[PDB]
């Protein structure tokens, strides 16, 4: 038997992302922990050194009631041990099959807790791919706890992801089609099909023939049979929108009438001792949102007359341009051959004495030295395709902290 | 009395006043000045930080006061096209107007106190205050008396309400009551600008023949001449230059000497207006209580 | 290997969107993190270029606009 400190490892209970997960038992007190075992002999063989580094990085600073905690990470010259919180009951995937689906009472309660953790992850700029009922575990008090972050990735502002790593099911269409995405919308889609299994007991998109399965996904069609309450069907059609821009957001789910029904208030933001004052001041900020954020104007454009109170500091611009009456482009676009474009953008760069570095045939990392303050300002040029005969050159900005 | 609003403004930083998402316009100094004024109307903004591309730094502000100063200065009157405004860049006009009136750029750090912000506003006598990030060198927001008093009204429980808040203005002695700069109903717009130049006040209450207020010509209402491109005929009256709002202005915001300071402050943040016109029973203007006066009575109780 | 298809997120311009008339003229809706740092521009008219980008500071956002000859 191999022990870690005073934790003797016993019953193997984890498939892992590749590496076994066993139960740890405190030899002194019988306290149970969950240990993810990663021997250096296996991981080193691949290029997953940064992948599991990425997993540990994300999970290291997480602390949420419905996310499995990472207590410690111990290294030996032979293996690496991830010591996590142990919960008995296994996946809620086994909470199905057993029992008969779930009530609106029960399936919603779990969905609430699960979503709470998903929110927590996204708030920390951490998306979690492979978000399926097998990665959601239950404790003794039947509380859902999100588990395997092997395919997770930290979201960076101004940057999309791709990779496409999820399960055959539970994976958003933009993922299976190998298209780049922001992050959260992919997680929403996975949760959307989770809520289905919690209410139906089965999957919305399944097929033995896998190529015909990915077809069933990219087409936004699924059946909501018989008993299924109308209030939640509107949520499913929303969470499972093939168009990612019309797809529901967490904001759109928190305010959904089905999700509001009897949810604990301790989930989500609301609700040397200034912390009791800094948390009080924040509540007063979100209360009057009109002070920090611009609201959206009314939608109807068929109204004969529209009465409303205009801000005093925007009347002259208003009364002149509106009484009886420019678009912003993203970067620049052309219709030239894509590789012929890249040839000419470097010419322009060479013509300005810039330091450029090629990452992809359509992705540069150009650097300039400011001839006044001697400061290095960076930016990224990425070429895209818009039409069937039109390309888009995108200009991104790179900040550098030392 | 002394110390609760002082403590409040000394505890919070400028960063707290900054909206979670706002818009900031920046002009290059080599831009034509008339082009810039239209750009103000375009984005619905009063002022814009000035970027000297040669010096690689911000150098000041372009506000409505600049527009007023351009107009009063180079006003060949009136049918001959204004020439010194059509062909004139920002930098070239800062070589004329800013000279003999040099007001160097005054900014403030986001992590700097809200107290020093109000202090900087009064000490420098400026209505704008560019909150500039010390690192990166980015301008984040332009601070105003209006934004400060609003946040003040917003983020305080009046359980430890001070005494003076429930006291009148007559006893508190807040505001200006001597030599009130104001214009008649018939007063030419050009003459109003000249008052704006020598008195350097934020607004001019419009009085009738009896000396009673019937409207108000704020510095803000000047870009209407830039919005409607009616800036070439300054011969017209103030009341005609204020016709663009017309029936949609609901009246001039006033106050009395006998009503409490809290009454004045509350009324002043609901209106989102810079100053109130102090007035008696017969609507005769007798004073002006501005956001400048109020915030001065809070930093210095 | 073709250059990647442009993600629909970048096709939501906060400056092309119009704010409520009751709100402060300077305020903008909350942007998502993915539109940050990207450069936006107006149609080049006369001889003045109008560039734009949205940048974050801690948890505050600012959409800077620049007019340049």
């Amino acid at each position: 038997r191999v022990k870690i400190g005073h934790y003797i490892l016993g019953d193997t209970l984890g498939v892992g992302t590749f590496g076994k997960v066993k139960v740890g038992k405190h030899e002194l007190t019988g306290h149970k922990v969950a240990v993810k075992i990663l021997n250096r002999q296996k991981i080193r063989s691949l290029d997953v050194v940064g992948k599991i580094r990425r997993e540990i990085q994300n999970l290291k600073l997480f602390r949420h009631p419905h996310i499995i905690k990472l207590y410690q990470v111990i290294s030996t010259p032979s293996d690496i041990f991830m010591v996590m919180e142990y919960v008995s009951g296994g996946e809620l995937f086994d909470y199905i099959c057993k029992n008969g689906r779930l009530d609106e009472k029960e399936s919603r309660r779990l969905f609430q807790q699960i979503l709470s953790g998903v929110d927590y992850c996204h708030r920390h700029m951490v998306v979690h791919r492979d978000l399926k009922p097998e990665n959601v575990l239950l404790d003794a008090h039947m509380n859902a706890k999100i588990a395997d972050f092997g395919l997770s990735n930290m979201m960076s502002d101004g940057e999309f992801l791709r990779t496409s790593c999820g399960s055959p099911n539970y994976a958003a269409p933009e993922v299976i089609s190998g298209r780049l995405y922001a992050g959260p919308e992919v997680d929403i889609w996975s949760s959307g099909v989770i809520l289905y299994a919690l209410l139906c007991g089965t999957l919305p998109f399944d097929d033995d023939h896998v190529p015909t399965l990915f077809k069933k996904i990219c087409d936004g069609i699924f059946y909501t049979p018989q008993y299924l309450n109308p209030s939640v069907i509107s949520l499913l059609k929303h969470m499972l929108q093939v168009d990612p821009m019309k797809r529901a957001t967490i904001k759109d789910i928190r305010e959904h009438e089905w999700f509001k029904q009897d949810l604990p208030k301790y989930l989500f933001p609301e609700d040397a001792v200034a912390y009791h004052l800094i948390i009080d001041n924040r509540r007063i900020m979100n209360e009057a949102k009109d002070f920090y954020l611009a609201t959206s104007p009314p939608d109807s454009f068929l109204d004969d007359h529209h009465l409303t109170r205009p801000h005093p500091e925007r009347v002259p611009f208003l009364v002149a341009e509106t009484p009886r009456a420019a678009k912003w482009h993203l970067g620049i676009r052309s219709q030239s051959r894509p590789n012929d474009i890249m040839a000419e953008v470097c010419r322009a760069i060479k013509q300005l004495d810039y330091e450029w570095k090629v990452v992809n045939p359509y992705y540069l990392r150009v650097r300039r030295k400011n001839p006044v303050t001697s400061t290095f300002s960076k930016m990224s040029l990425q070429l895209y395709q818009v039409d069937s005969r039109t390309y888009l050159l995108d200009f991104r900005s790179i900040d550098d902290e030392i | 009395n002394s110390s609760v609003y002082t403590t409040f403004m000394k505890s919070h930083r400028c960063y707290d006043l900054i909206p979670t998402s706002s818009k900031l316009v920046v002009f290059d100094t080599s831009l034509q000045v008339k082009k810039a004024f239209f750009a103000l109307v375009t984005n619905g903004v009063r002022a814009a930080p000035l970027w000297d591309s040669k010096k690689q730094s911000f150098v000041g502000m372009l506000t409505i006061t600049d527009f007023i100063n351009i107009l009063h200065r180079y006003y060949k009157s009136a049918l001959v096209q204004i020439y010194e405004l059509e062909e004139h860049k920002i930098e070239t006009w800062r070589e004329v107007y800013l000279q003999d009136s040099f007001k160097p750029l005054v900014c403030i750090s986001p992590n700097a106190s809200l107290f020093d912000a109000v202090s900087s506003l009064i000490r420098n006598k400026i209505h704008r205050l560019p909150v500039i990030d010390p690192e990166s060198g980015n301008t984040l927001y332009i601070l105003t008396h209006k934004r400060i008093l609003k946040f003040l009204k917003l983020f305080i429980t009046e359980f430890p309400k001070p005494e003076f808040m429930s006291k009148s203005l007559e006893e508190l002695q807040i505001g200006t009551y001597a030599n009130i700069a104001m214009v008649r109903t018939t007063t030419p717009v050009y003459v109003a600008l000249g008052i704006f130049v020598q008195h350097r006040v934020s607004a001019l209450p419009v009085v009738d023949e009896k000396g009673r207020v019937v409207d108000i010509y704020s510095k803000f209402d000047v870009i209407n001449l830039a919005a409607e491109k009616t800036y070439n005929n300054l011969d017209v009256s103030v009341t005609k230059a204020l016709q663009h709002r017309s029936h949609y202005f609901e009246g001039v915001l006033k106050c009395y000497l006998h009503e409490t300071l809290e009454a004045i402050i509350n009324r002043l943040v609901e209106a989102e207006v810079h100053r109130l016109v102090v007035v008696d029973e017969h609507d005769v203007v007798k004073g002006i209580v501005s956001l400048s006066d109020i915030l001065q009575a809070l930093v210095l109780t | 290997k073709s250059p990647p298809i442009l993600p629909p997120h970048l096709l939501q311009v906060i400056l092309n969107k119009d704010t409520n008339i009751s709100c402060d003229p300077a305020l903008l809706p909350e942007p998502n993190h993915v539109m940050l740092n990207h450069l936006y521009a107006l149609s080049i008219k006369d001889s003045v270029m109008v560039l734009s980008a949205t940048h974050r500071y801690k948890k505050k956002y600012v959409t800077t606009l620049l007019y340049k000859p």
Binding site: I332, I349, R368 | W51, S57 | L39, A41, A53, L66, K68
Partner: peptide
């Protein structure tokens, strides 16, 4: 010591000046 954001704009302008026709 100069705005990082404006410098980013300043740089983009120099590039587009050549590219745009």
């Amino acid at each position: 010591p100069g705005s990082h954001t404006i410098e980013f704009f300043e740089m983009c302008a120099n590039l587009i000046k050549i590219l745009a026709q």
